[PDB]
Design a protein around this ligand. Sequence first.
Ligand SMILES: [Cl-]
Ligand SMILES: [Cl-]
Ligand SMILES: [Cl-]
Ligand SMILES: [Cl-]
Lengths: 509, 509, 509, 509
Amino acid sequence: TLLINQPQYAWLKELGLREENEGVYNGSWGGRGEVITTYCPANNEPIARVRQASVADYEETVKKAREAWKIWADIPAPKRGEIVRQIGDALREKIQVLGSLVSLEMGKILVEGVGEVQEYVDICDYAVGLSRMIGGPILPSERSGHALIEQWNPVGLVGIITAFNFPVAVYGWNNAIAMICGNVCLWKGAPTTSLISVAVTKIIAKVLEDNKLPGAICSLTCGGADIGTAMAKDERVNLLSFTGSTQVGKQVGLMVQERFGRSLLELGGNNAIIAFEDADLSLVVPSALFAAVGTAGQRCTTARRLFIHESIHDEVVNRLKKAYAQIRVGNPWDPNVLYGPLHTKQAVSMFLGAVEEAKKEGGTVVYGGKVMDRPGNYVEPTIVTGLGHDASIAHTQTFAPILYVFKFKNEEEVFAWNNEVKQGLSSSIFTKDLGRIFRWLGPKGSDCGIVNVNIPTSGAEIGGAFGGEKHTGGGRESGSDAWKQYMRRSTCTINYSKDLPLAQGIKFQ
Amino acid sequence: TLLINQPQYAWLKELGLREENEGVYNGSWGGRGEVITTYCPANNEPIARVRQASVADYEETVKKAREAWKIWADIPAPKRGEIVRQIGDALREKIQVLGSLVSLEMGKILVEGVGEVQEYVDICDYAVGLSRMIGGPILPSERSGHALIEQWNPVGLVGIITAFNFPVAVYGWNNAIAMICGNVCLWKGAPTTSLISVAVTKIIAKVLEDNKLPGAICSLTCGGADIGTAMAKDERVNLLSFTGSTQVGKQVGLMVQERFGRSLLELGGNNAIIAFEDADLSLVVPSALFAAVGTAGQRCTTARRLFIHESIHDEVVNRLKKAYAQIRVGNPWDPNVLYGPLHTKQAVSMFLGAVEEAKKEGGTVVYGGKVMDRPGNYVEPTIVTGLGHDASIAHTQTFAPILYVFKFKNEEEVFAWNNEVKQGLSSSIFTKDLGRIFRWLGPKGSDCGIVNVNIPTSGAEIGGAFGGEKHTGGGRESGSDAWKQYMRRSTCTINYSKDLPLAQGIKFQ
Amino acid sequence: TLLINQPQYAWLKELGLREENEGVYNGSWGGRGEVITTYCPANNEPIARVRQASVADYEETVKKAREAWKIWADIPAPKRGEIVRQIGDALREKIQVLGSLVSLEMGKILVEGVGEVQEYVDICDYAVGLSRMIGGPILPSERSGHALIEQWNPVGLVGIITAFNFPVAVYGWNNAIAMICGNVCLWKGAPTTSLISVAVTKIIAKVLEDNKLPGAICSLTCGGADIGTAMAKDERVNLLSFTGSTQVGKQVGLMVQERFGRSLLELGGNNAIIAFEDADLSLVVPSALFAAVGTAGQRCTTARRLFIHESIHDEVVNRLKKAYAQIRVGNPWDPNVLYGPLHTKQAVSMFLGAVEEAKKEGGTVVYGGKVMDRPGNYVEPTIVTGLGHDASIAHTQTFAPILYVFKFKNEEEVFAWNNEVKQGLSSSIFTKDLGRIFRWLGPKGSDCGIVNVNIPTSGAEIGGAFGGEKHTGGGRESGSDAWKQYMRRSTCTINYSKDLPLAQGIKFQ
Amino acid sequence: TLLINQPQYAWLKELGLREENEGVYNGSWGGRGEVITTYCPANNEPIARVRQASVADYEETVKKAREAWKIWADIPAPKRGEIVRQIGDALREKIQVLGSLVSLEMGKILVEGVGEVQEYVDICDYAVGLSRMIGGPILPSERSGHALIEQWNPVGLVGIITAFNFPVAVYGWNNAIAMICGNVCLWKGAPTTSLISVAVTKIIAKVLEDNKLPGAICSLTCGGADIGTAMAKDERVNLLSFTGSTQVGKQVGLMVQERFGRSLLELGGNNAIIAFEDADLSLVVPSALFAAVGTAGQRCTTARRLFIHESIHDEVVNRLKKAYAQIRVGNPWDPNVLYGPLHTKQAVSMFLGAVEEAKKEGGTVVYGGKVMDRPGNYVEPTIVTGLGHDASIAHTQTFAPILYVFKFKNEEEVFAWNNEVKQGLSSSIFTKDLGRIFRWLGPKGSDCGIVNVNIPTSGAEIGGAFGGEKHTGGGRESGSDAWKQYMRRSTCTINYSKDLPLAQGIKFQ
Ligand SMILES: [Cl-]
Ligand SMILES: [Cl-]
Ligand SMILES: [Cl-]
Ligand SMILES: [Cl-]
């Protein structure tokens, strides 16, 4: 009855998964909390069970994590980098079966499941070199006989709360950077990707244990809102990296600020692609299709708003319709499929609610709009035209493959329309105009954290910092100097001279 | 009756100050809120009056600032730097009278009032060069035919709330950096230093007007908590830099987080000096005195906790008492005075309460402890021995010259005691031991933002970032890459190739 | 008979110039070498006289500068920056008269003479902030208990040899950076700009004297090749910055390399403008004209080669001919003048020789080509068509306003033709094509140190490093991390632990 | 007769070595030059043969490397990093056999031979992250509508000449950095380590072939002075990295300068350890011993001058003598052996010549001084006292384990004595004094490129730049921004606005 008990899914055992799995790791495996069963969204069947963290589990894990930090922080950063290099290799060894698990439990297609693991592998190899580079400048003091140095030190315990839609890579970004920076980590993944969290944690735990290091360096406490709220309120959690909905991130941001902790927020996106009249349409059409329907439209960076200049709107919409019709639907592990199921049955219903609401606001469904007549959580990728850019349904993030299409005329208004929504994650223009490109990158251009040209709103690489502005929450992950959010800066002045301050007419001995 | 009407203080008119001054600037001068009279803390005489901002004044100023930003953001950064260079020159022109006004209205001694203006001048000169340097890296994309650029753009309107104790330098740090970064500024200074705020704004306004720039680039709205709260809640204020008490700053941080704004918080300090057995006592004793009694103990970085190794505790305390007896107290503008009044009568009351509480918690006043019987807000610089390091009064920041002295035996405990309070601004050890110094700078060392060796807790220059950790709020001002808090990062990918994404079995047109 | 003795030129006295001037400064003024008279290239009249450095004067000066270095290197970098800041202010105060002297003695037009002084003013303002930033990273050692620091220290004495065409700015670039980096400077300018060198040195001297610093920090030894060769061979000259011809610079590089010294070489350019078919012609023609005839074609960055796509070649040449006819020629101090004389009569002879050789190799003079019939060194700006891109006369740098125009068809060949010359300083393409622009900036694009797009070859500002590749010598001046050429890097490891290396079975004590 | 034919050395075959080996690789293997036989310095026995490069071999290989560059430079740097990551793994798999070959052919002890391979492995893992970081800033232009970006591009062909004493790591440092920077490499190793150069090249060649890349990206032309001179004179060799004697490097540097090429010179060292009176003698003695006799005193960073304060001179020499007597001598591959043979028979004669000359100059041999009566090139590690610090024998770099010991009294003279030699590679002081340490790191301290405190002159790590000053040639390898030497900087201004230059009263159309 459980997928893991059927011979067809015996590969799950290669990740150390059993029918019932421990969802707490702190050097020891356990879990006295509520038992949840996660389901395969492609067939609505249960996969296996995870025993989540009780309050006592969480309490003991923080204490073990903070004790482990005393050991971990004393390990020189390049040697911490060597640990992270071995994690990358351990992910490389399991990339296919781990990616299959992402496809099975979360529901994205196999290439994206493996691709998500590869992103973690890449950030590991990146972090290895970074582990020899993090630090600050030695600066020229204005004072004779004084040295002035900017030091960076770990903040301590980094709590990491992640979402269902990227159940490996977001944690991996946070883990690899926090680790080389000398922090310990506590992970609370999405409950519906609990098997993924356990499996990832098993791979990391082995590297840590094989190197005679305390496992609490990369702790796991599977749970839901209760555990995440505990982390948000916990003074022992020095940095809380949160990836999830804007609604919850706001509450997490407030709870962390209330205690003068640190938060790193990666919240919703409502991402726009803008196509100008001079754009290469043979580039626009595939870029739009893949940015809209990739991962069944459940990416933070999924394209939700497509603005097309009036002169090319009908052509681009028509070319998208003909292209949508060829999107191959099926099981996410079959390599022929580009499009899998939504993550939950609730999401299917929410998809239908949004299509209906779009119709109520005057939009026309020119393609899709319906649930597919097959098992699982499959819906048609959908294109809605005729809404005004200020339509209410278009200002909501719905994790469904619905692309709202708008007309525009001039550059200034459509830049403003890109910027008018509350999120500020990703954005793209398609144009050949040199001045427009640099204006888009400038202070009167895109207000988002990811600002792309002739490439869609999706697919960012690790070399750059990843994150958004406005209600997207402002945190950054992965590249550039994002590592500084995982460390505390100190400005340090060393007086090494024999000089004595001026007496100022006080007679000292 | 007003000091500015007496011929003795005619130098005040050199700052353009009159009997009643407008406390709103946005290109025009005004102020329809309550008229405030500010008093000289050395003799309680009224200096002059300021008409503060009403709600409508605030509203118009924000709109005018944001209109001005549209112009200011288009001016190339080095040219904005040129503007900041002229601000520095205009301050140099008035440095003596302006520093005299700081001594008169705030009450710190003349050399510090002048020095605070110099600090603003210096950050201006620093910002000139920085205006040709701000930016991010061009990074090697992993994709052929793609450029990968990290861009920085202004956040927009920078609200700056400052405190009484540095009524020039804190604003200046924020202003010079925010300006070269392309932001407009709105200043709400402390009500009791309103004349300083007006006099500084008159200097800047002239520079802006002479350069045919809208004055709202450096707007002023004098007011109290009501205006400060309006700024924290105002979505048009993209960054709120708040310098003040931890209690108010916590609410400021929460209100800004509530609306997904940005805050830069510079809050309380509870700064410790630690003297080890190998310390050069001829360095310890004067460093401790000046760090404790400087600015009448009213710096954020004032030394409030003195840990002395048991072997040298009595000697250092005795030598400290004998040096305290030689502190020259008087009017802060008089040439040989080292110690002036507290800023307000409420501060005198807070001083008396803290001294009372210290006795109730088991402390002994071995020097000072009393209000001085003279005109003005003068209190004796005070030394308290015998409290436990965890006494509650020692864990509170009181903006009064009270130095709590402790014994210690070993390095590990005293580092933990440095770190055990909620504040985390500045810290200092005095020792000759090389290993101890670098442990102090390391992950098990001081948890503060300023970590000093053989120099007191007020050693900081503009080249380094200024700010603290934990309840000090986490913001940084002035040097290093502190400028990044005033800008928004974007990770920009430009596909410049003619390449078309992979079909993935869809036949495009 | 000397211009400085005529009442119309009495403004020369505002620079401290007299009928006979000392050309050696090392704290005191002197000069026992040959007396040189410099002449005005607009009318060949003598201006004033300068007593150049004898060899003994050179010996005395190097010794005084090196003693002064002991003082200067102990001054904190930001305080050195403060000195450089006052130098900027001192130049700002004399900008008009000094700019007029540049126009008078060197012969460039007044607006460019004034602008050249402004460049020195600007690098001063830039260096002030840089003086608080120079340094290296603190790196995380792989060894426990070890610190790893990259330090930068002055090299000592920076010899600066400059050329006639930028007799202020090149020295100023080298001076301001070397100074904040803790070096002393010894300047040997071009003999034909000796008055300018004295005037600049008099301005710097007063600042050093007013700040009680040894004047030898900015030493001057006016002389010709003999003094320059001693500097190249002098082991006491730790860094030799040389700006001049490739022929001399090659010998300078070899002499400095022979003694394992450091050289900074800024040699010839043979700079190309390339206009593609899609270029904005209303942008091309003015940019080309001004880049070719600016400073009478005597800039290191002067456009000497103009490649035009076949489809627009004839049109652009015709529009360039029609625009050249409007070039206003006259005395460089006269208002409204765009074009002055060549610097020397030898340059007149070199111009005519190049024009004749161009015809002898098959070129057609389509505009200009002749000496002007008027006093001074006036030649007509010249455009030559019909030569092959590899014509020998076109591959020589002749500091004369002769523009060689070529046809091209394809991007690859014309990129190759940009790169085929021995020099490698500046280069420019005019185009709208996004892919072409980034290829131009890429590894298969321009091989030059300055690579510009839709702006001519003289588009340089101080924020970036300035210099070229190949036979241009490879040095960089002014911006970016160019300061590192004036400093020596050290990689410093501090073991602060009590740890003792492994005995390796040796019985120690 | 050949060691490779004896069964004990059958492990050599795991590196692809046979009795006679090809020493030219450019995608194909060959060698038409003279066949060289390399000998084991531990027993003077021949190991195997390598066919070196003829002139035609060199010509063909350069042409093939320059063709391969066209492909390699078009590969995005992070993908180039992926190749270098695989080189690191391929080295890891063969680390034992390769390290053993270093011991066999070069003669250092096994743990150091293995350690040299690890340094290559580590720079690879480092470069993987660095390959996502190399680049320059985008800078704020002073011109509206202009972008200012600093680009870095490969120089092209990086010629790499290495020496016998570090036959793997130096090439590896240059190779890994040059590769991620987009250059191709041509390697000419030391003739007497030809088998090592072949073995390393076979490992890289397989990685390149398995990745379907042209093998000439990492070309090899084994040879002696003739090939090296050809590389120094070859304009197709864009950068020549030369590691070797000062005598040869000076000539190489001049040849490269003659053609306006780029050189990176890593030449002789004459490195000093200075022990002050307050030094931890239990730290001084082992550190000195290992730095003098490690690698039989054949490191570039070997300690050759030991300055000891007169108060502890006699004690330190005695403890060093008693410790030298316990050095375990034997075959370098034998476990627990700390001291092996000199590299050649010529080195034995040089050692003897140096000892006699040291005695001739008044030095007293207090330990060693004689050849060991055993097979191989074994000489006793030697300590010489009684010389003046400026003794001629002490100012020569002799690649022999001779430690010259001097007395001193004061810090200033001994810092001056450190700096008085022509080399400037490594240096160490041993002291506890805080002020002295920072004076040592400062402008009046060590003039060397490596400046150490409480550790010997050896043991550089990957994170920092490695190299020296003065006659050491000035090049840097490995860490920090040393990668910039393998690339060319361009300062790029893009005008993206529709603005037209100022007419300046010319009537364009
Ligand atoms: Cl005392
Ligand atoms: Cl299509
Ligand atoms: Cl010993
Ligand atoms: Cl025209």
